[PDB]
Every structure is written in structure tokens, then in C-alpha cells.
Subunit: 273 residues, 2 copies
Amino acid sequence: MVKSLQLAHQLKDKRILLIGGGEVGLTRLYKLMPTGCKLTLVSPDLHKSIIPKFGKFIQNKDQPDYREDAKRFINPNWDPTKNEIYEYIRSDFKDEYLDLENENDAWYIIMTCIPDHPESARIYHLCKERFGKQQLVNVADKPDLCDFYFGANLEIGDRLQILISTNGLSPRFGALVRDEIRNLFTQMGDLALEDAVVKLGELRRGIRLLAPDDKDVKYRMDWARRCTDLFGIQHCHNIDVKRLLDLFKVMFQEQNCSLQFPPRERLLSEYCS
Amino acid sequence: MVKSLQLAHQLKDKRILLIGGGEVGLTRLYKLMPTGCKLTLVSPDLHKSIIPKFGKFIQKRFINPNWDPTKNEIYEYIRSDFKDEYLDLENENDAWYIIMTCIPDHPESARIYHLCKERFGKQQLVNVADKPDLCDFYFGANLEIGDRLQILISTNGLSPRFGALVRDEIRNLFTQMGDLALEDAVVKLGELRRGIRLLAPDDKDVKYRMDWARRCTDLFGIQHCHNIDVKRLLDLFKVMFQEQNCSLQFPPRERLLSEYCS
């Protein structure tokens, strides 16, 4: 059978259209907000958490509003770091909300999560007709109207994100795999990536200095890779860079670019800080 | 720092354009080929593994005479440097779902990105290999857990090396575990769910039914779900439900695994 293509989208400053602000809408918001996307939310009513969490500028419906278009709210002080809705339109979707006043701009992603299925299908088809089949669309819980699927997620300390997708299995299985992965890193505790980052840096540099440069130098790549694979994510933060540089020097020169490190158990006892 | 949005795209039968059939192109083919996508590859020359693995029919334009999404093969190969006219699609209700470049010339790569964004709009997905500012998305470290589960690891301002290391760690976890027999788990979780509905069909116990299944399946975990004894868990559900006023307090995990597995 066919696999999905799993991708990590860079949404900072991208215009995103979310139609439906209820329970499913809110879960869409939890995933979209930390991305820096510039989102327009269209919904006649909102789940109770949305205003306080992501759009404190939206006014309650019973406050008098004398603007010519009282349904539209623009966050007056928006930026990608806010984690805030950019634009809220209090209304059922209407075709003219697809218009971006400015026609260089475009919606990177258009999503729906409303209780009307025939209206969702109509929106999907209108969006593909207006913006082409290249326009990404997702109609919540309607696989035939989705270009992509959200799945089970987990974060491994602020810089690592994992997505778990199923190819024709219940989402249930994705959540079980997620908890399993989360248990694994929970048991592992601190990975101290800050320090792992540094040391892989000075490892790289150090080896470049000893390098003997263009041409085996892929050996530098394959050497740093095999070495760090043998330490793994658990121990890269604890490598003694100087001892490994002395081991590289010997494997690079005087061994003819050997790529045959010592057994893992030894590498961990002789070359960790 | 912003987080990325990780998504799983359904490309079965979608047109995909790849420009550059070298080393980097070969790595793009590895990820695109199992997706059922209908790919056009544009390149004057090809890395030697491409034809053998993905375009045997290649032996200016080469159309695969026996293409289908299960083949894992290129649909169309254009032996040429990219020309603007290769953006055109016969039926123009058709579109390229993703457009990717993997060529050594930077200005030409950037020209292609802007041309595609101009012609197909900023909604058009584009990725220029190794040029962050010309990419709408990034590939990352992947692994399969069977032929049914797919995992993507992405780094946020961290070398991709960490993605690979986390990936190899998750791979090892599932390697230790052994066969998960998810086809059987799928069947048992279905018969479990059907059974519970019968023991508690009224509209008012919907939620209970759900949380009971969820807590139960959580406790068996991905590793043991294929081995549950449905009948026996049904008898356990009966007691927890009727008798114990909808109890969600289950036998402790190691008993649950010993008694309720076959």
C-alpha cells in the first residue's frame, strides 16, 4: 500500500484560513499557533478558550459596534511570536472571505471544521476551483476532502518535534506509539542538547582542522556520523572531544581512513567526559 | 523560535515535479516513491541508481508505459535542463502538488522558485534543496514501524544529526519489541468495541464505552494489543460496567497482561 509523505512546514508569516471555531477548531489552533502563521479564523461563535488564549483583542458580540463591517476583527499588535489569531470574522463562511485584499498574498493552508458536511464539501471544491488543486485543503474528519492529515505529536524538549501517522489504521494506534515514544524519552531524562550541540560543533571543527580536506572529506562526514551514532542521542552531550579528536587523527592518517571504531561499550568508557 | 507544522500528505496519484536527478534528487525519489505520486523528473543526466530502481522503462521525453501508484516508479522522465514549458500540464484543471529542485545552479533554482510561485501562486508548495529561504517545508528524519506506522522527526534550529539520532533511538525501541501484529490488534480492537456496544448500547453510556476502551488499550499498549483475549475482556467490561457503577478502575497492569492476553 501507499505511504504518506510526512513534511515539516515552515509557516512563519504564512496566511492560514481556519473555518469553524469550536472544539475541533481549538485543537487546530493549539497546533497552528506556535508556528508563527498569520491566521484568519471564520466562525459565528467561538469555543470559550479561544478569545482568552489566542485573541484577547476580539470583542464580545453584545458590545455595540458601529463599524460598517462589525463582524471583522484585526489584531492591532500582531507578530509571529504572539501566538495570536491575526484576523477573526464573526460569521458563517462566505465566498468573499477567500479574497486577500492584495493579490500577491495567498492562503498556504485552508481548513474547515464545521458541523455542515455539504457546506464543507462546497468550500473544498470552491477552494480547489479558485486556487487550483495545488491549494492545500483539510476538511476535519473527512479523509476524501483532505490533502493531508494531522496525526499524533510529541515534543522532545523544545527543539525536537515528532509526528506519528498511520496508513489505514485507527488514530488510536498513533496515540499508543506516541505514548511509547514519550515514555522512552521520559525514562531517559536529560539529553542536555545545548552541550551536545556545542561538542558536535567543536568535534566538527576539530576534525576539519585535522581534516586533510577536500576529497576524503566525506570521511569527515562519515566519521562524525558513525562516531555520534555509536554515542547515540543519550550520550552525545557527554563526549570528550579531545580524546575523540586524538582517535580521529589515528583513524584518518595512520590507518587509512579507518571507519571501524572500537566497540560501543569501550567508546563510552574511554571517550566520554 | 517558531515550531514547524508537521503533516502527512496523501499523494496517491497526485502529480509531482522534481528537477535535478543527481544525488540529492535520488534522496527525494526515496521519499516520494512509496507515496503513489505520479512524478515527472527533469534532468539532462541521471545518478546511475535512478533508472534501475525507479525508471526501468527509460531503458527527450519518456512516459512509463505501465505506471500505477503501487509501482514505485517515475511516471515521466524529461532528459533536458529545466525549461519553463515543463510546468504545463495537458489538462489545465491539473496541477503539481509539490514542485522540487535539486540542481547545482543557485540563480536558476531561485528563478524556478519565483516562476512557480508567480504562475501557481504562493499556495504552490516548493522546496529548493538546501536553501531554507526557498523552502515551504523541510524533509526530516523518518522511520516506518511496520508498513502501517510512519514517524517524522524534525529539529527546530538544531542540526538534522539530532533528528537522525532520535530516529535511531525510536527504531531501536521498536526493534526490541518485535512483531506488533497490528493486523490482529486491529481486528481484536474492533471486536472488543463491538462487544462493549452490545453490553452497553444505550445512548447515555457512549462516553463510558469510549473511556473504558481507551484506558484498557492504553494499559495493553501498542506491544500487547494484538494479544488481548476479547471474550475475557468483555466479561471484565460487564462486571466493571453493571456491578461497579461504570468503574474505570482496572486490574493492575501485570495482572491485566497475564489474565487477559491469550
